[PDB]
Design a protein around this ligand. Structure first.
Ligand SMILES: Cc1cc2nc3c(=O)[nH]c(=O)nc-3n(C[C@H](O)[C@H](O)[C@H](O)COP(=O)(O)OP(=O)(O)OC[C@H]3O[C@@H](n4cnc5c(N)ncnc54)[C@H](O)[C@@H]3O)c2cc1C
Length: 456
DNA sequence: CGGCTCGCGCA
DNA sequence: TGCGCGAAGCCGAT
């Protein structure tokens, strides 16, 4: 659909029909940003060709009840800034509350939308919402992959077994899709309160808050300032003083040598393509640059591939055949310890290293990348069954992680528990051939004592 | 057949 | 600390 700096492969038609005479409505669900948003840019270009204004519609679902205050405030303060940024470009934004399958279809009919465009997410509930929109509307419906550098349906057409099978495919398409973003043009044609939605939601999630013994909240909200502007500064700081040492100290939780970009990446407050463009041009350690690029390009986008082609990405059935057979044979093995969800949640296990990992998650909302493996694998070792451990790991991940409820989370848990995108290892009791980590193994890599004392 | 994102002995 | 082997199933280039 026209455009000189737009690859047509980033868009795909979900519904074909007669284009209406009204404004083009952009349904924002995953990429909550104004700059470096392909879905917003593609919606603006279609509006420009048809001589119509562009409007942004967001649907606030009841999903925040399952999560906590920390993610709700992080998102809401992000959208409040996004409202002002879109207003500076004369692009009105509408915030709806209710079922997306019913309210979004009603908005298109009420506002007489000419064309509807939305971002891409391989999550199950997004596809269900999309199908309900299809049956209700008659305007054309398009979908744009504004999250991945290479669109998920173009990088691969099947479930990839491992990265070494996905890395050559992904890197082969970099010269085509790795390009600079064009500036978003303001609207020429001019035509609920976010504060009220925030105050009402907070009161509902107040009883479910995480508290200490003295009825004091555990979450520390000053570690990550939400929004698009703050996400840019985090990326700038990481490239400047942190990217050089990333290759060596990325596995040391005692050092703050990570990019800390996951909370902004999950909510789409910064584009991974923009980060890739800046990292590529930056002159840093070649080993560190390669290590970081493998995480933000191969592993981040292969998680989207895993969820898009495996609808049961959060289930035991998504595990490979070798993993299921090994875990099934060890179902009746006696576990060293058995802990419930509440015991895991409160960090009341015999392992000080595991408790410190959970305490960091409870306080900061973002556990270090290395300890998250030990966090998830010990859940498998000290649970009733691999189904319960998968249930517990997912429940704690999506509740307390700022970057939770993300395809990286489900694929990351499947790696640690089900060996997805991994290989078999030495046979062991209970865990079987799933990759094994030990407290002693962490002692030979980093100062475990410093990590434990930092989080009680 | 080669090579994949742990533990462990060893400088 | 960094290095090399060990224990293990399978994809994919042929
Ligand atoms: C059991 C488990 C659960 C996880 N839960 C989540 C989750 O809910 N949400 C989430 O976003 N990530 C999750 N991850 C992935 C990983 O822990 C985080 O992406 C990362 O630790 C966030 O810190 P960072 O961005 O500073 O790391 P960095 O090293 O700076 O990572 C840079 C970026 O690369 C991507 N990335 C890095 N490591 C991975 C990985 N292993 N898999 C996929 N993408 C990766 C992310 O987009 C991240 O923002 C989980 C991992 C495991 C093992």
């Amino acid at each position: 659909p026209r455009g000189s700096h737009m690859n047509p492969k980033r868009i795909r038609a979900l519904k074909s029909g007669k284009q209406g005479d009204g404004p083009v409505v952009y349904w924002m669900s995953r990429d909550q940003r104004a700059e470096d948003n392909w879905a917003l840019l593609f919606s603006r270009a279609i509006a420009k060709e048809a001589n119509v204004p562009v409007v942004v519609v967001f649907c606030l679902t009841d999903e925040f009840l399952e999560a906590g205050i920390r993610q709700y405030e992080f998102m809401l303060k992000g959208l409040q800034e996004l409202e002002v940024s879109l207003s500076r470009k004369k692009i009105p934004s509408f915030f709806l509350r209710g079922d997306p399958g019913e309210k979004i279809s009603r908005f298109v009919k009420d506002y007489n939308a000419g064309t509807l465009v939305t971002d891409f997410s391989p999550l199950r509930i997004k596809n269900q919402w999309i199908e309900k929109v299809i049956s209700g509307i008659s305007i054309p419906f398009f979908e744009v992959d504004a999250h991945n550098v290479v669109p998920c349906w173009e990088a691969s057409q099947k479930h990839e077994y491992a990265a070494h099978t996905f890395r050559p495919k992904l890197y082969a398409l970099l010269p085509e899709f790795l390009e600079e973003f064009p500036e978003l043009e303001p609207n020429s044609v001019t035509p609920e309160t976010l504060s009220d939605v925030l105050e009402t939601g907070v009161k509902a999630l107040l009883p479910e808050r995480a508290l200490l013994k003295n009825k004091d909240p555990l979450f520390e909200p000053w570690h990550f300032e939400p929004g698009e502007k703050a996400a840019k500064k985090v990326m700038e700081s990481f490239i400047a003083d942190r990217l050089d040492s990333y290759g060596a100290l990325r596995n040391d939780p005692t050092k703050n040598m990570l990019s800390n970009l996951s909370p902004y990446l999950h909510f789409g407050q910064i584009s991974s393509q923009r980060v890739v463009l800046e990292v590529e041009k930056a002159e840093s350690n070649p080993g560190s640059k390669k290590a970081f690029l493998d995480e933000i390009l191969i592993w981040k986008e292969i998680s989207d591939n895993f969820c898009y082609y495996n609808p049961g990405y959060d289930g035991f059935e998504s595990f490979p055949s070798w993993a299921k057979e090994s875990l099934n044979a060890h179902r009746n093995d006696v576990r060293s310890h058995i802990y419930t969800l509440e015991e895991f949640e409160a960090g009341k296990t015999h392992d000080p290293l595991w408790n410190a990992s959970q305490m960091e998650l409870l306080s900061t909302g973002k556990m270090h990348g290395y300890t998250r493996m030990y966090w998830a694998k010990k859940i498998l070792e000290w649970s009733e069954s691999p189904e319960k451990a998968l249930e517990i790991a997912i429940c704690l991940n999506d509740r307390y992680e700022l970057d939770g409820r993300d395809p990286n989370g489900y694929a990351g848990i499947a790696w640690s528990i089900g060996g997805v995108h991994d290989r078999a290892w030495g046979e062991r009791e209970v865990t079987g051939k799933i990759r094994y980590m030990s407290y002693e193994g962490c002692k030979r890599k980093f100062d475990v004592k410093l990590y434990i004392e930092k989080y009680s």
